[PDB]
Design a protein around this ligand. Structure first.
Ligand code: 0EF
Ligand code: CA
Ligand code: CA
Ligand code: NA
Length: 274
């Protein structure tokens, strides 16, 4: 009855989980379209909503719910298995039903997250431009010790140009690209100097409203693999700093090719969590 999405062992999260580290006590905020809190495979401990007319524990789009499931679907006898199934999960709603958000809404969510003591923030969202306030927000979150992860973008490549979106592009944020179950880069994955690591992003099955499970493709889906990993690292080495966590992830990554399309490569949690 429980399905193991291929991304889990592809990043070796399963080997870490078997060590006894599952993210217990680590706080992760999912900055997204909200989360279907009543899903039986998810346990949402709190959150906030910065979108008018929608509470934070409903997901009318599904995206938030799916991203969250990759970070933390419960390890049990049903549904799927998250990368860090015991993490304390918060839903922070910054995107509307249609999957879009405003700058001030996103910034508010980052700030909330920093203020409320999150350890890791996941932002499967992004655009062609940033804002100064957005930059301030992210830089400040990192400086205070939160690991900040974002999807690089689903723009593919074109010639020698950078298709890395913001906030991923900021240097205090990890930009994650997508690979498929064969470990190959997916075509839609953005490219650029800032790309940092890769994770599973094509054909990712996860939680999905209402009470079901579905497969989506996107750097959006690769991002939470990284957030979940950081969370595992922290549960095994609580003394680490954000940048140390960041460093472990990119240094032990599996090389796949040039950094412009693959950054340092595919994350390897077992290696990173040593
Ligand atoms: C996750 O993969 N998020 C990706 C986009 C992204 C961009 C920059 C940095 C990180 C991630 N966003 C989406 O998939 C997003 C959700 C709701 C709309 N959607 C779009 O960007 C769609 C695909 N674009 C769309 O509206 O463009 C048209 C229809 C042409 C106007
Ligand atoms: Ca539930
Ligand atoms: Ca489950
Ligand atoms: Na980056």
């Amino acid at each position: 009855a429980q399905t193991v999405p291929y991304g889990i062992p592809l990043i070796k999260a399963d080997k870490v989980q078997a060590q006894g580290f599952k993210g217990a006590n680590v706080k992760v905020a999912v900055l997204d379209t909200g989360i279907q809190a009543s899903h039986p495979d998810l346990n949402v401990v709190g959150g906030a909503s910065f979108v008018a007319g929608e509470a934070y524990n409903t997901d009318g789009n599904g995206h938030g719910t799916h991203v969250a499931g990759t970070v933390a679907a419960l390890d049990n006898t049903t549904g799927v298995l998250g990368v860090a199934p015991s993490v304390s999960l918060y839903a922070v709603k910054v995107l509307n039903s249609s999957g879009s958000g405003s700058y001030s809404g996103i910034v508010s969510g980052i700030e909330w997250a920093t203020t409320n003591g999150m350890d890791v923030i996941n932002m499967s969202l992004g655009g062609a431009s940033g804002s100064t306030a957005m930059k301030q927000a992210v830089d400040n979150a990192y400086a205070r010790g939160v690991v900040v992860v974002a999807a690089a973008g689903n723009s593919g490549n074109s010639g020698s140009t950078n298709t890395i979106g913001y906030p991923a592009k900021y240097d205090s944020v990890i930009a994650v690209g997508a690979v498929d179950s064969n470990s190959n880069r997916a075509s839609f994955s953005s490219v650029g100097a800032e790309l940092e690591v890769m994770a599973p992003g094509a054909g990712v099955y996860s939680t999905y409203p209402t009470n079901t499970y579905a497969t989506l493709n996107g750097t959006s889906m690769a991002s939470p693999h990284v957030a979940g990993a950081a969370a595992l690292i922290l549960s095994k080495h609580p003394n680490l700093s954000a940048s140390q966590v960041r460093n472990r992830l990119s240094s032990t990554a599996t090389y796949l090719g040039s950094s412009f399309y693959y950054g340092k490569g595919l994350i390897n949690v077992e290696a990173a969590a040593q």
